[PDB]
Design an enzyme around this catalytic site. Structure first.
Site: not given
Lengths: 699, 699, 143
Positions: B355, B391
């Site tokens: 995250d 990401e």
């Protein structure tokens, strides 16, 4: 329909060419859709005279030549782009911006909700987009004439004063001469006022070699400071890295600040005095999101700023100010190095002092630029000769982390000021510790520079207490700053000498005056380059305010009153500085020779060297130093004995071998005949809280 | 007077040894003066049963063996040191701390002014020192029995499902089974509830291969969240990196969370299902200065935390949360890698999802740990086999900045979700762009992994809109979160289909249901590993709340109602997933073969490829892939034609060569005989906002 | 760990040259014909390739967990530190060792070196690091 031409990318900013009769304009912007040059007539600052769309672009650089414009011409920019704050894209062409490469700025910003680029005001805050024009309130960048008649030829080229012979003088430009009444009004507390004939002879009479000026980059008073009727007095919020502060100009702000600064420096050099400037690179005045859009944030927010990844509407903060330059981008690192180069070749400054340097190194390290930043300084033709002053920083695992420090690199030794403050306060300190400080701190400088003169020793600075307030004050009194006293360093190691603030008690004043003298000799007897706080000689006081960053008034101004107490101290400082300069014994390049002593006048074995002490005795033994600075001629300095008694009680000292002669002391009282000269180990009754310096005379 | 022994430094934390009949205790602390181990009896949590001063220390590691203690034993620490907040030294032995290496935590924290370490309360805030004991409110770390009977032998060793065959399923542990009424109360919304027999057959019937669980590290509900009567539902505030969240335990919190988790995982593996866990390393729940002293800040603030140099009372923030681990210090980087290793060898997790990974990489880069962190993962015996999901991030100049990415490294493709959302919304997009997304995004993955399966494709996730809310909603409705709707992403690219929220208009519902089907095929027709938002099959809705991180209630729970609309969709998803798994044409390893088409049924020249489109037609041509995963046996998949019509208008398509047979579509209506099979280029009248998949049958 | 037994080009093709020459060996840029030598033995392993660095760390881990060995003494440590330095791996090699659950416990023995741009160029050393004092013997053998 104008005979405009593409012009050149180099140099950045506005450039007046004699030959092509006109001015080349250039601005870096990577993410802009469109750039607009705005020219303003002196008569009207609210609306541009002429608007020119900048259409030629070489790489990330927008540029246009504009014939007929001349030194003195006001201008600004409007930069066009996306406004997606969530992507860190904050382009607002309604906001009239300051050229990053402006060499002058025509005044201050006028605080109004329309200089912001978001609605105030709204509850989306920084997400919104404010349509209002900002030009009415944003000073304009100014085209300047770079030409100047330097006859500091003797100085500049090439061999100025080194750190081994340097006494630095930290001085605010405005406060220095604001109340020097024998100066005409309009030049009081200005660059020209500072280098005026009497100011020069004063600084010369004091004896200081190097002036360290407090921030001169064009800064901005914070909103929350002006709402309270206060300005940003210290200048620690640059908005532009190339322009002298307009506020300190006696000759106006359309080139006058550049000319007066250039003037002031030239005078100083001709007097034999170096100029260091205090510089801020760790943040800009634009602040965080929520701060104004005055320059960088308008030109290209994404370049220029360190953004929070995963939330680009927010700015990274290493300093607590709100922003950080994006030092990894080649233009930003260029601007810094371009700033440093400008101020040396063009403004003739001899070196720099980096404010929040631990932060500045953290930011650099953050993007893998610290060691390359150091290599850039070292190999650069002009930058590798200037003085560069910083502070210690262990980052973040962290020992300095750095291949090689510039030749004239030095650090503020806060450990020196703490140790010294604590010592004279009565705190018994490990002998080894207090002694090392006096020896220039080899325990800190193992392989940082191999010289004691990498250590900038000081007892006071712009930070916290003025030497006067240090000896008169137990806690800060900063309610005037309007932060209900929460602002400013709390660990001060100070002592009021029996009464808080001004007192009638001549017992308290005798403590104080005696004590000031104690610090002044401790400082000018230690290895390392010393720095003195301007005002300290004048017994300057901010009456307990230990963080007067926002007091542009009575509190901070230098007080030129010839009170006899004050006068007698100014006399002491003069004498001691002179003494320091006069003897290269206290100024050694290689210490990284002395002999330390006990109360009963013997050498110092371990335990004695390791247990807390309140009394330091030592001899600067030997003489033959190498040289001097001239072809092959070694000198020899007289041998000195230094006795520092912080113990609040009288004590009896056994002197070492030879004849000793008292050269200076903290005794305010007259000196008894058996104290002027002492021989054959016979003991003297040393008073409590007293400092003393003897030279040997035989054999 | 106890037969205590020095014990061992390794392993960190509490360690039950069968043989020595007792528990080794160890805690890392570099700056502590003194460490105290606290043992608590189940009966009393306010005062320790026994206090043991930890006296043996190997390097930076405090340790003691304590005989007779056993799995289930509650404990904590009190750590002793200086309290100079200005130096970042925040030692408060009044505050009872959580062991950083605790494998279990006995409950939640009870919010009370005394868990803070500074006075609330006072106006010096974080400068003050709060004397109150914190033990009453701080859950205790628990000694666990590491032993577990794994019969997931078949799975673990060694060749699980690769990313080329992976369908991921993002699912909250609590919400999944909170209202699964055919489960007994005490296991509803728990680890055991999740791996229960019917849940397993459900996940098996759906067809998903990989479960991605939302944060399971033991987290803390924020003060400002509980003052408002809300909990932290998503679990993005770890306080400990080794303990399963106590809240999701059906079998208690004294080892029960460890046992149930280990149980749940084992069941899942035996069913052929992988476990990815969502993990937070970029900040801790302790927050900034001002936040609670629960663990790290108490154990050693200076290590552990990134501090502001020049003002060490403040913490560096890259995420906006308040802190950053000091990833440059070998222990902190060790703890992270120790966490990752624990969860794989001991909790049998198949990989991780980081995250705020852009932030995590920024933090790492900040202290020159990014590339070494990557080398640590790659060479590690256990860590180089797990899946690692992140990401994109360009830091800060910044292309990834990284020698080499792990074999099973993949990134969430937010560009894929935006492009796809915009396309079906009616936004005509550059053909090349929409097409590249379908091809797995080679324009993003030039040299990041050389595989389409580094791209995690998705239309919805825990972030923003549920696939149901995406097609039903034009702006967020997050007033329930109590931030007057300022929280949560604003760019959603959504469309309500004609009515905001629930409506009676069967024209609006037909739009919606048809549209859901459109996204579901777009997603399971594209190259790259797809991830589905748990609930999306059940037509799950948070009724416009696009950021339900704090809604542990009705809003977020999965709704197991067998409504026929919902049921028919669950049927569609099942069918499409099945179709995806059934055909390795949509699952190619090397794309970084296809032929794209126009309306008038011809190949696609530039211009056509470069102008915005509303209609995509393409053929997955060829077959021979290499292999399969077994010894030397190449397969061949049937050739497929995909027609995606986002244009809101009916349109007439010329089919390409051969016979084509409709396998699945977004038509809710029955299929007309001339739509089931089409040949010889003859045109079909394609409805507006419709998706269609054909297989060739000859020749 | 600073060279294999294959020597330079003109070397026996025993293993690494044959398996994958590009990976495994640091080639001379502009003349990949040849092999970069730091030790005067003919080759240096390509420690910047993840598998090459993995091999070394695998081998250290093998001899400890599997062969029950208590420590290593790196021969020609300086050259090894330099080779590691040449490709930006020295410090990451040292972080790998300290954080490794088994490798951080063992003794580790090298020599002193002055690499790259002065000093050691390492943040922290492993917790049982020690060094062949190259010069304590030059000193006691002179008094």
């Amino acid at each position: 329909d104008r005979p405009l031409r593409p012009g050149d990318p180099y140099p950045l900013g506005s450039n007046w060419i004699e030959d092509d009769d006109g001015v080349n304009f250039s601005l870096f912007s990577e993410n802009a859709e469109k750039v607009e040059l705005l020219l303003y007539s002196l008569t009207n600052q609210k609306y541009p005279k002429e608007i020119i769309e900048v259409k030629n672009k070489t790489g990330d650089i927008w540029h246009v030549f504009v014939p007929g414009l001349r030194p003195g011409q006001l201008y600004a920019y409007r930069v066009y782009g996306p406004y997606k704050p969530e992507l860190g894209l904050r382009f607002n062409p309604n906001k009239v911006l300051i050229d990053p490469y402006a060499k002058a700025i025509n005044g201050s910003v006028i605080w109004n909700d329309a200089v912001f680029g978001y609605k105030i005001g709204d509850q989306n805050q920084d997400l919104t987009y404010d349509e209002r024009d900002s030009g009415e309130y944003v000073p304009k960048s100014v085209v300047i004439n770079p030409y100047f008649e330097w006859d500091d030829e003797d100085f500049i080229k090439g061999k100025k004063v080194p750190l081994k012979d340097t006494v630095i003088y930290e001085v605010h430009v405005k406060g220095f001469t604001k109340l020097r009444l024998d100066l005409p009004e309009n030049i009081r507390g200005t660059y020209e006022g500072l280098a005026s004939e009497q100011m020069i002879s004063y600084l010369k009479d004091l004896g200081i070699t190097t002036v360290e000026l407090m921030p001169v980059f064009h800064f901005i008073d914070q909103r929350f400071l002006t709402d309270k009727g206060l300005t940003n007095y210290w200048g620690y919020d640059p908005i532009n890295f190339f322009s002298p502060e307009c506020r300190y100009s006696s000759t106006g702000c359309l080139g006058g600040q550049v000319l007066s600064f250039k003037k002031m420096v030239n005078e100083l050099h001709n007097a034999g005095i170096e100029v260091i400037i205090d510089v801020v690179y760790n943040h800009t005045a634009e602040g965080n999101h929520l701060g104004p859009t005055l320059s960088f944030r308008g030109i290209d927010n994404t370049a220029y700023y360190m953004l929070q990844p995963d939330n680009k509407r927010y700015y990274l903060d290493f300093t607590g100010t709100g922003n950080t330059l994006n030092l990894s981008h080649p233009r930003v690192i260029q601007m810094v190095l371009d700033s440093l180069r400008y101020w040396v070749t063009e403004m003739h400054v001899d070196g720099f002092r980096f404010d929040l340097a631990a932060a500045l190194a953290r930011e650099l390290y953050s993007v893998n630029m610290l060691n390359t930043f150091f290599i850039a300084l070292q190999q650069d033709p002009i930058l590798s000769q200037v003085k560069l002053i910083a502070e210690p920083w262990d980052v973040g695992q962290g020992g300095y982390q750095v291949g090689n420090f510039p030749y004239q690199w030095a650090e503020w030794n806060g450990k020196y000021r703490d140790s010294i403050r604590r010592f004279w306060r009565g705190e018994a300190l490990p002998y080894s510790e207090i002694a090392n400080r006096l020896l220039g701190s080899p325990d800190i400088y193992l392989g940082n520079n191999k010289t004691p003169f990498a250590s900038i020793n000081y007892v006071t600075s712009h930070d916290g207490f003025t030497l006067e307030d240090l000896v008169s004050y137990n806690q800060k009194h900063n309610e005037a700053n309007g932060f209900n006293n929460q602002d400013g360093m709390n660990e001060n190691y100070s002592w009021n000498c029996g009464a808080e603030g001004p007192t009638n008690d001549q017992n308290v004043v005798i403590c104080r005056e005696k004590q000031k003298r104690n610090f002044m000799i401790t400082l000018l007897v230690s290895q390392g380059t010393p720095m003195i706080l301007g005002g300290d000689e004048l017994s300057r006081t901010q009456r307990g305010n230990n963080n007067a960053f926002c007091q542009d008034n009575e509190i901070t101004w230098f007080d030129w009153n010839l009170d006899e107490r004050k006068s007698k101290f100014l006399e002491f400082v003069k004498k001691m500085i002179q003494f320091y300069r006069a003897h290269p014994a206290f100024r050694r390049e290689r210490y990284f020779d002395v002999t330390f002593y006990t109360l009963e006048g013997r050498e110092v074995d371990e335990k004695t060297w390791s247990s807390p002490t309140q009394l330091v005795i030592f001899v600067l033994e030997g003489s033959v130093m190498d040289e001097i600075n001239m072809y092959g001629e070694r000198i020899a300095d007289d041998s000195f004995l230094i006795i520092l008694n912080a113990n609040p009680n009288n004590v009896k000292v056994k002197f070492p071998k030879g004849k000793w002669e008292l050269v200076i002391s903290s005794y305010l009282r007259e000196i008894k005949p058996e104290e002027r000269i002492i021989e054959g180990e016979k003991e003297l009754e040393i008073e409590g809280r007293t400092a003393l310096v003897y030279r040997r005379i035989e054999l």
